[PDB]
């Protein structure tokens, strides 16, 4: 009921909002609002391995896809 827990995500620690774009960090498996971590929805299809700003420090920077599906 009203006292149920809800999952929270991102650096902002908010529950999910379907109107906002999010990307998963491949390392910590948390999810991040593009607006919170500087990733545009339209740029994300080019990201291969996404690492959040915290995970970057030990797991390395995000990588880009070397090939893409057109169509």
């Amino acid at each position: 009921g009203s006292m149920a827990t809800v999952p929270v995500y991102c650096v902002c620690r908010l529950p999910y909002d379907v109107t906002r774009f999010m990307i998963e960090c491949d390392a910590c498996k948390d999810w991040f609002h593009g607006s919170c971590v500087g990733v545009e929805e339209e740029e994300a299809p080019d990201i291969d391995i996404y690492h959040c700003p915290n995970c970057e420090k030990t797991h390395g920077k995000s990588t880009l896809k070397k090939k893409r599906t057109w169509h």
Binding site: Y16, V18, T19, R20, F21, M22, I23, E24, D26, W31, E41, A44, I47, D48, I49, Y50, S62
Partner: peptide, 6 residues
Amino acid sequence: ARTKQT
């Protein structure tokens, strides 16, 4: 990457 679209 895995994403959640709008």
